[PDB]
Amino acid sequence: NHSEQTLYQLMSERLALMPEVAKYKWHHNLPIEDLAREAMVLERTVSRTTVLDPIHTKTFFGLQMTAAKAIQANVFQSLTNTDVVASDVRSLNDDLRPKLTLLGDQIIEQLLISYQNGTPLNRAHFDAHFAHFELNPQIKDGLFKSLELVLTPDPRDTLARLEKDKTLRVGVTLDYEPFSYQDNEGNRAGIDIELATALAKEFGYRIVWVKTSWPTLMADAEDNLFDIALSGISITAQRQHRMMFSAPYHTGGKTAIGRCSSVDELNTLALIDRAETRIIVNPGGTNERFVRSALTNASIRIHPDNRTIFNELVSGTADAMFTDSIEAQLQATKHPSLCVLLDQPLTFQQKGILLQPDPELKKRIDTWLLDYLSSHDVSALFSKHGVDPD
Ligand SMILES: O=C(O)[C@@H]1C[C@]2(C(=O)O)C=C[C@@H](O)[C@@H](C2)O1
Ligand SMILES: [Cl-]
Ligand SMILES: [Cl-]
C-alpha cells in the first residue's frame, strides 16, 4: 500500500530534520517551542485540508509537532557537554523550515490521496515504521490514532427535529465518574451532566436522560434512542464510522491501576503482562479493546459493573485494570490502597460528545463547546468532581 508507506516516510523525514533544528536552537540559546511558528503551520495546513475534519487534522499536525519537540529535547540533553559544532549549524529559516513546509505540503497531498482511496491503515506497519524513534508510547499512539480519525468519513435530520420539539435526548451511562454517575442521594451527577445541561440551556433545549451503556452504546445510537451522549466517551475511529463527535473536551490515555502493596511487581507493561497477573476490565468500550490488543500473557476477567470493579483490585481478586488515566487518578485518590501503576499513559485518547450524524448539529455543538472551554473554568468543573487539575 504505497499511499500509507509514503505518508509514514514523509512524517519520519519531518522528524529527521529535528536534530538539526535543535542544534540551531541550542547554538542560539533558543527555546524548543515556537508557538507563532506552530500557529503559522497549523493555519496553513487547515486551509489546505478543508475536505478533512479540521479538529482531527490539527490534532494530527499538533502531535507531529509534539513528536518534533520531544526529539528536539532528546537532542538538547545530548548537547549538555558535547555542544554544537558551531560550524555545522544549519539555518532554521533558510534551510530547515522551508524543508518542513515542503514536507507539510507533501503530507497533505498524501492525506488527500489516502482519504479519497479509503486507504486501510495498518497499525502493525505504522509501529514497524516508527519503532526506532525515541518517543514515548503516548505520542506514537496519538500519531497513529489522530491520523486514523483524519482518514475516516449517511446522515440524520436530528437538528431539524430538535428545532421543532426542543427535546434533547441525552444518552448517559452513570457508571463512569467523574463524567456520569449517581451520588449516594441517587441523582445524576458529573462533568457530563453539567456539560449537557449548559448545552441545553444555551440551545434552548430541555433534556430527556436516556440510559445507555458501553455494550449497547452504538446499537442505542443507530436506533436513534438519543440525539447526543455524554459519559466520558472516547473518540475512536470505529465509533466515528457510524456516529459523529464534538470537539474533544479532555486529553489523556490508558494507564494501569492496582494495589500500592503490589506496585514494584507491576510498575511496567512487561511486569503487568505476565501469565500470573489477573486483569479485570469492564465490557464493551475502549478499555476492552485496549487490553485485547495490548496483552498477550495476562488472563482477563470481564466485570460487568464499572461502579464496583475497583473493589476487586482493593480486595485482591484482580491485580491490575487498564483504564483512562483520569479514572485511574480519581480511583487512586478515592481508594488509598490503590495507586496508578505506570509512569505515564500508554495511549492517546480524547473524550468528545457522541452525536447522531448531522453535520449542522456538529457545527453548532462544536461552536458552543469551544466557546465554553474558553470562557468557563473547565478546571473547576473537573475539580468539583474529584479530578486533581494536573
Ligand atoms: O522550530 C521549529 O520549527 C520546530 C518544528 C515545529 C514543528 O513541528 O513544526 C514548529 C515549531 C516549534 O515549536 C517546534 C516544532 O520546533
Ligand atoms: Cl484519560
Ligand atoms: Cl470508552
Side-chain angles (χ1 to χ4, degrees):
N1 174 352
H2 154 84
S3 192
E4 172 191 51
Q5 284 304 133
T6 299
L7 183 49
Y8 296 166
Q9 183 57 39
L10 289 164
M11 294 158 67
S12 49
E13 267 165 49
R14 215 170 105 64
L15 293 179
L17 285 170
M18 297 307 179
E20 299 293 350
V21 183
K23 287 163 82 294
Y24 181 91
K25 278 168 178 165
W26 183 253
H27 187 59
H28 284 284
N29 308 128
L30 277 177
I32 297 203
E33 191 169 79
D34 186 347
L35 283 175
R37 171 63 167 177
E38 283 191 19
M40 282 182 337
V41 168
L42 286 184
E43 183 136 310
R44 186 205 186 79
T45 308
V46 323
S47 68
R48 291 154 171 226
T49 54
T50 51
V51 73
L52 310 187
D53 180 314
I55 282 169
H56 290 334
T57 290
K58 262 192 293 183
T59 298
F60 170 62
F61 271 82
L63 270 158
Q64 296 177 265
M65 286 173 349
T66 298
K69 292 132 70 157
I71 279 154
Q72 282 173 66
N74 294 358
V75 171
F76 267 28
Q77 283 266 3
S78 217
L79 296 166
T80 63
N81 276 59
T82 293
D83 196 53
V84 299
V85 175
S87 61
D88 284 342
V89 166
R90 279 181 58 192
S91 172
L92 191 73
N93 303 284
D94 267 48
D95 188 355
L96 299 175
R97 276 168 167 170
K99 280 184 191 55
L100 297 180
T101 296
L102 199 102
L103 288 159
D105 278 340
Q106 287 169 15
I107 292 189
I108 286 155
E109 280 309 295
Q110 211 57 228
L111 285 175
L112 295 193
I113 286 158
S114 294
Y115 185 75
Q116 284 306 342
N117 308 5
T119 307
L121 293 182
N122 198 299
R123 178 50 186 265
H125 301 342
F126 174 92
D127 285 10
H129 196 71
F130 289 96
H132 72 277
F133 285 111
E134 199 80 42
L135 290 175
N136 74 31
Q138 174 181 57
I139 300 175
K140 286 198 219 215
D141 187 63
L143 275 175
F144 180 79
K145 291 289 179 50
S146 49
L147 179 57
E148 188 177 39
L149 277 164
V150 165
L151 283 194
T152 86
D154 187 359
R156 275 212 160 107
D157 279 294
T158 300
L159 187 57
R161 203 273 281 129
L162 284 173
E163 286 293 296
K164 268 78 79 185
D165 75 23
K166 306 289 185 174
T167 303
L168 183 67
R169 305 175 300 130
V170 174
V172 292
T173 63
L174 304 182
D175 75 353
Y176 191 149
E177 162 161 35
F179 294 106
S180 80
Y181 65 95
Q182 298 185 285
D183 47 19
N184 208 127
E185 282 295 69
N187 301 106
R188 295 177 305 268
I191 292 154
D192 286 352
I193 303 309
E194 296 195 46
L195 274 193
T197 307
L199 162 37
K201 311 279 207 209
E202 225 257 357
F203 279 60
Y205 293 160
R206 68 153 177 132
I207 300 161
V208 177
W209 302 96
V210 182
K211 185 78 156 48
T212 183
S213 62
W214 303 106
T216 64
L217 177 66
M218 293 302 293
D220 295 336
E222 282 152 19
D223 298 352
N224 208 4
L225 298 183
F226 49 71
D227 296 325
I228 73 174
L230 296 73
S231 272
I233 301 148
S234 299
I235 298 170
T236 71
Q238 37 257 123
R239 289 171 184 165
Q240 185 159 313
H241 197 130
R242 310 95 191 61
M243 286 296 134
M244 264 182 209
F245 282 104
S246 74
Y249 62 98
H250 169 82
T251 300
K254 312 307 201 162
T255 200
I257 178 174
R259 292 176 296 285
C260 307
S261 54
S262 266
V263 80
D264 287 359
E265 297 81 9
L266 284 190
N267 60 14
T268 257
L269 181 60
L271 292 191
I272 299 165
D273 193 16
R274 285 169 305 185
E276 327 88 38
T277 328
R278 297 83 50 56
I279 311 297
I280 198 165
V281 72
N282 66 305
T286 54
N287 282 350
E288 176 170 19
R289 188 161 305 252
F290 181 68
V291 302
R292 283 194 175 304
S293 71
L295 292 181
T296 44
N297 303 299
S299 170
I300 291 150
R301 157 155 63 122
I302 301 297
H303 188 86
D305 188 354
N306 188 62
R307 291 105 60 195
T308 71
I309 189 178
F310 301 101
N311 312 319
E312 295 308 287
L313 290 176
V314 166
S315 78
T317 70
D319 301 326
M321 171 196 196
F322 296 80
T323 190
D324 296 344
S325 155
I326 185 186
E327 198 174 8
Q329 293 288 343
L330 171 51
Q331 302 296 340
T333 297
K334 181 191 302 302
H335 296 281
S337 33
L338 309 180
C339 69
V340 178
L341 310 157
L342 298 174
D343 238 297
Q344 186 168 38
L346 289 173
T347 72
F348 181 95
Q349 183 184 267
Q350 289 175 299
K351 302 304 177 176
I353 302 165
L354 189 76
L355 302 178
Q356 290 300 325
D358 179 352
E360 254 312 302
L361 185 58
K362 169 173 166 48
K363 292 327 93 184
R364 286 197 63 197
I365 289 173
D366 279 358
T367 287
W368 166 82
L369 186 51
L370 291 163
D371 146 68
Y372 196 76
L373 301 172
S374 287
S375 68
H376 295 267
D377 201 12
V378 294
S379 189
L381 170 69
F382 275 58
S383 153
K384 170 167 195 271
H385 293 294
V387 179
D388 179 298
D390 283 348

